[PDB]
Design a protein around this ligand. Structure first.
Ligand SMILES: OC[C@H]1O[C@@H](O[C@@H]2[C@@H](O)[C@H](O)O[C@H](CO)[C@H]2O)[C@H](O)[C@@H](O)[C@@H]1O
Length: 230
């Protein structure tokens, strides 16, 4: 396909269901892959402050095993996720992500689609505290909501692209998106947004949320099959 489509996983043993599809890349919300999967670029994630102790080793290991991208904190805007102030994330990004910029493309912390001061509000606060000192190759963003809200998904992704552009960051990865409903509604959502993302110059990569919901009893669900085939 486009080369944009990724596999976001928990159970590594479910990636096999997707073997041969138009998938370039994977991530697992962890700094280490939990094994090896041939033919796919694994992208390590510095999920939050619990990861600081191992991160330099984890990043070097990922670079040596062929990773060319690194992701920063997972939903620092959400207190049940990485739970970090914009100021804290800007300092930690400069400490833990910037040193890898010569050898890996670096993704921003990934924000939710919450209203300000969460979501892209948080992201703008983070890009303000960075003050040009964070080496950011792309913004990472998340959108979850009903399958009928395509309009709101596109609105959110366009808003993220525009925000990146105000701070000299050309492109985004949509590292989680989920058009929610029954399997039929989920497939209709993918039929609408997958082509839209594939032709969007602003979006480098994306991952429908997520491999372990798209696989039941070893088999792609109708939603997993649409993710493989659209
Ligand atoms: O199990 C590995 C890591 O899983 C994390 O949960 C992920 C969320 O952060 C994310 O937004 O959703 C995915 C899929 O539901 C979750 O795997 C934990 O919060 C980490 O503690 C955990 O190490």
């Amino acid at each position: 396909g486009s080369g944009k489509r990724g596999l976001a996983y928990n159970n590594i043993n479910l990636l096999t269901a997707f073997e041969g599809g138009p998938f370039s890349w994977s991530y697992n919300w962890e700094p280490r892959p939990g094994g090896y999967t041939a033919g796919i670029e694994y992208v390590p994630m510095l999920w939050g402050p619990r990861g600081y102790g191992s991160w330099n080793a984890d990043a070097e290991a990922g670079i040596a095993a062929g990773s060319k991208n690194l992701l920063a904190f997972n939903e620092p805007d959400i207190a049940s996720q990485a739970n970090m102030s914009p100021e804290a994330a800007a300092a930690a990004y400069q400490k833990y992500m910037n040193p890898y910029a010569a050898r890996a493309r670096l993704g921003s912390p990934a924000v939710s689609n919450g209203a300000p001061p969460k979501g892209l509000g948080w992201m703008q606060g983070f890009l303000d505290v960075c003050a040009g000192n964070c080496k950011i190759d792309f913004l990472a963003v998340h959108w979850h909501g009903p399958s009928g809200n395509v309009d709101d998904f596109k609105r959110y992704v366009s808003e993220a692209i525009a925000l990146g552009q105000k701070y000299g960051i050309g492109t985004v990865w949509v590292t989680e998106f989920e058009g929610q409903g029954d399997e039929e509604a989920q497939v209709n959502f993918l039929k609408e947004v997958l082509p839209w993302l594939d032709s969007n110059a602003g979006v480098e990569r994306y991952a429908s949320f997520f491999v372990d919901n798209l696989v039941k009893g070893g088999a792609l669900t109708s939603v997993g099959k649409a993710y493989k085939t659209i």
